């Protein structure tokens, strides 16, 4: 019953991180649409890689909570 709230807090943390990172990716895309550059695209690639890592972490935590509720 306490692992459940632990995983819920873990998920809330991850989701806040993911939403902030999506905001930053959107801003960087708006900036690139006007002034294109290679450093901006490399930074966008790094941000997308971090987003993939965060999504995998979220997915692991959600599968563990689904197992616990089972």
């Amino acid at each position: 019953t306490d692992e459940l709230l632990r995983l819920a807090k873990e998920q809330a943390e991850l989701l806040k991180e993911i939403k902030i990172l999506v905001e930053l990716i959107a801003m960087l895309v708006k900036v690139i649409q006007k002034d294109p550059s290679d450093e901006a695209l490399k930074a966008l690639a790094e941000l997308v890689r971090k987003l993939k890592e965060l999504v995998e972490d979220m997915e692991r935590s959600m599968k563990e909570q689904l197992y616990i509720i089972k």
Partner: protein
């Protein structure tokens, strides 16, 4: 942090209408000799600007975020790599949740009650905004009851009245419109003039 403000003694507060002018003016200010720069969260796509100025960090610049009125903005600014957070007001929740991250937060005060609240929250370096409304008289008058508090005045700091502010006993000054308006080479000349004046007096 305390040492960077004590060393460089000037922060460039940067407001712009778009992001490209912001990046151009930040580069020009750094060329002029100002190593401390703040991008206000009133410039469109400012976290992107903070992220795309990381090349200046290796040259020796310190980049921070201003006009932060939310906790989500603090998160978004620390993500893109802001060294410090600044706010035109004192917010207790931003302090509570920025102290848990280890990020430097400089809130803004105008009265002694707000000052004592910030001190109770742990803040020894405060932002004095609007500085032109209270004058260096406010800084001189606060030495008595609060010796340990140091101020960074923001608001109507000029080339004329900067020596007054430094005689009053301030760590540094945040210079806005007097510094960052005009074409990016007039901005470099203004930054040179300000650095030379601050090292003169």
């Amino acid at each position: 942090m305390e040492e960077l403000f004590k060393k460089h003694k000037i922060v460039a507060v940067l407001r712009a209408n778009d992001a490209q002018e912001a990046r151009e003016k930040a580069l020009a200010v750094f060329e002029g000799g100002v190593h401390l720069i703040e991008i206000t969260f009133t410039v469109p796509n400012a976290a992107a600007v903070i992220l795309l100025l990381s090349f200046l960090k290796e040259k020796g610049a310190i980049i921070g975020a201003g006009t932060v009125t939310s906790e989500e903005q603090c998160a978004l600014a620390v993500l893109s790599g802001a060294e410090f957070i600044v706010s035109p007001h004192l917010d207790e929740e931003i302090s509570q949740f920025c102290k848990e991250k280890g990020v430097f937060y400089m809130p803004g005060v105008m009265t002694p009650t707000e000052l004592v609240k910030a001190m109770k929250l742990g803040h020894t370096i405060l932002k004095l905004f609007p500085g032109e409304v209270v004058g260096p008289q406010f800084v001189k008058a606060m030495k008595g009851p609060f010796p340990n508090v140091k101020f960074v005045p923001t608001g109507g700091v000029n080339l004329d009245n900067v020596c007054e502010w430094f005689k009053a006993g301030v760590l540094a000054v945040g210079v806005g419109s007097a510094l960052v308006k005009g074409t990016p080479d007039e901005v470099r000349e203004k930054a040179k003039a300000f650095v030379e004046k601050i090292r003169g007096c």
